[PDB]
Design goal:
- This is part of a larger assembly, with one chain.
- This protein is of the alpha+beta class.
- Helix content is 19%, strand content 38%.
- The protein is built from 2 helices and 13 strands; from the N terminus they run E-E-E-E-E-E-H-E-E-E-E-E-E-H-E.
- A 4-stranded antiparallel beta sheet has the order 11-12-7-13, covered by helices on one side. It has a 3-stranded antiparallel beta sheet with strand order 1-6-5, with helices on one face. Strands 2-3-4 form a 3-stranded antiparallel beta sheet, covered by helices on one side.
- The chain is elongated and about 60 Å long.
- The structure holds one RNA strand of 81 nucleotides.
- GO terms for molecular function: rRNA binding; structural constituent of ribosome.
Length: 189
RNA sequence: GGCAUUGCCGCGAAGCUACCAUCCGCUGGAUUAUGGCUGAACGCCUCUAAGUCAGAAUCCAUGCUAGAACGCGGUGAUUUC
């Protein structure tokens, strides 16, 4: 039933600093600074070393032990986007009507717009999330490479363009037009 | 000028009136269905378990009507001298 002890270990890379007090994880490193708040989990961190953090739990059930290894992976995605970073290559697919994507800075921030998506006359606004720079691949005419130091604000922004460029009232297996993600790489690789 | 239970006919202002006439009828947040993201369970996978995003003529506000005659606030003046 309730497992008496369940531990995981977060290997902390070189040059990377981690600051934890009352389940708030501030990570600084060679590029970027990430602060994720974890008050919703009963989890005890402990500094067993300067190179690796032990994360443990006590008397947890199957529900709670399952929500322990999701904590190690969330810190591991924090330090990985802080050492290397994250970049998402996205790709334009269209049958006839070309998609024309730009970047505009309106009153608030860098809205992303698409125009002529399947011949449509309505622009499709989608804001950037901050910490994410927006990049176009110059060599390939139909490509877009999102990038940033958090995997969350990139991938939510990468799924934002997938959600906004959908089809309506047609066969999706015939009308396979849209802006899909193909590659989820790191920045320094 | 009277009377004809407003004698009858034509025009008729005021008033009332008619999609028979004209004018007017608000925009913000959260969400269901559903599509997603990060990601475990289950050394893979997964939209869900912990998180999170987009979203219905829906919902709660904004707006509109009443104002508790036992809800309340602020000010004015307070007697024959």
């Amino acid at each position: 039933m309730k497992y008496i002890q369940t531990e995981q270990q977060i290997e902390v890379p070189e040059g990377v600093t981690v600051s934890i007090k009352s389940r708030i994880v501030k990570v600084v490193g060679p590029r970027g600074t990430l602060t994720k708040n974890l008050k919703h989990i009963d989890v005890t961190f402990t500094k067993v070393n300067n190179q690796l953090i032990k994360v443990a739990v006590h008397n947890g059930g199957r529900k709670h032990v399952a929500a322990l290894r999701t904590v190690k992976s969330l810190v591991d995605n924090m330090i990985t986007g802080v050492t290397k970073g994250y970049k998402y290559k996205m790709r334009y697919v269209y049958a006839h009507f070309p998609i024309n994507v730009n970047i505009v800075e309106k009153d608030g921030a860098k809205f992303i717009e698409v125009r002529n998506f399947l011949g449509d006359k309505k622009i499709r606004n989608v804001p950037v999330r901050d910490g994410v720079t927006i990049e176009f691949s110059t060599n390939v005419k139909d490509e877009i490479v999102l990038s940033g130091n958090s995997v969350e604000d990139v991938s939510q922004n990468a799924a934002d363009l997938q959600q906004i460029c959908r089809v309506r009232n047609k066969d999706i297996r015939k009308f396979l037009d849209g802006i899909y993600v193909s590659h989820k790489g790191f920045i320094t690789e």
